[PDB]
Design a protein around this ligand. Structure first.
Ligand code: HEM
Length: 147
């Protein structure tokens, strides 16, 4: 599923975009677009539109999970245990309208927003390495999800 070159390209793009923000300006610009393009997930996340600061709260807190998961892409025995739990958490949120169908799509559109921080440094290996790592990150959260 992943390779040493990709695992390295993943930890190399997370130390820059998530330097001190840990991915704060990554989900706020991604979730915001998802909420706008999708008016069915806004009430689910807890926002009224794309002009809501809450978006920067979820897209940010969520990015962190991807960070703790970036320190173990080849080791899917523990970093996947925490993500699997997040799914169980989404099984009873304040909206009870979560779905893994928005994950993939919201995951791909997320890599296009990461370039906003490392614009110019995000090469193909950066979006590809993360495009292969985010698959195991989110895919590992859909397990406990819909519980
Ligand atoms: C696109 C599908 C998703 C939906 C609809 C969704 C929805 C939500 C909602 C509604 C909350 C709580 C906000 C509130 O108070 O209402 C939340 C929290 C959170 N979500 Fe998601 N989420 C999705 C995908 C993800 C993914 C893929 C990750 C992981 C990368 C993730 C990680 C988190 C984290 C870490 C929190 C913080 C809450 C906690 O864990 O205690 N979410 N999500």
């Amino acid at each position: 599923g992943l390779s040493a070159a990709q695992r390295q390209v993943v930890a190399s793009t997370w130390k820059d975009i998530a330097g001190s923000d840990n991915g704060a300006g990554v989900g706020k610009e991604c979730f915001t677009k998802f909420l706008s393009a999708h008016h069915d997930m806004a009430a689910v996340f807890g926002f009224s539109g794309a002009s809501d600061p809450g978006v920067a709260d979820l897209g940010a807190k969520v990015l962190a999970q991807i960070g703790v998961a970036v320190s173990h892409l080849g080791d899917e025995g523990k970093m996947v245990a925490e993500m699997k739990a997040v799914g169980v958490r989404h099984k009873g949120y304040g909206n009870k309208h979560i779905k893994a169908e928005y994950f993939e799509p919201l995951g791909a559109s997320l890599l296009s927003a990461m370039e906003h921080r490392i614009g110019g440094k995000m090469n193909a290996a950066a979006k590809d390495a993360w495009a292969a790592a985010y698959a195991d990150i989110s895919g590992a959260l859909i397990s406990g999800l819909q519980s």
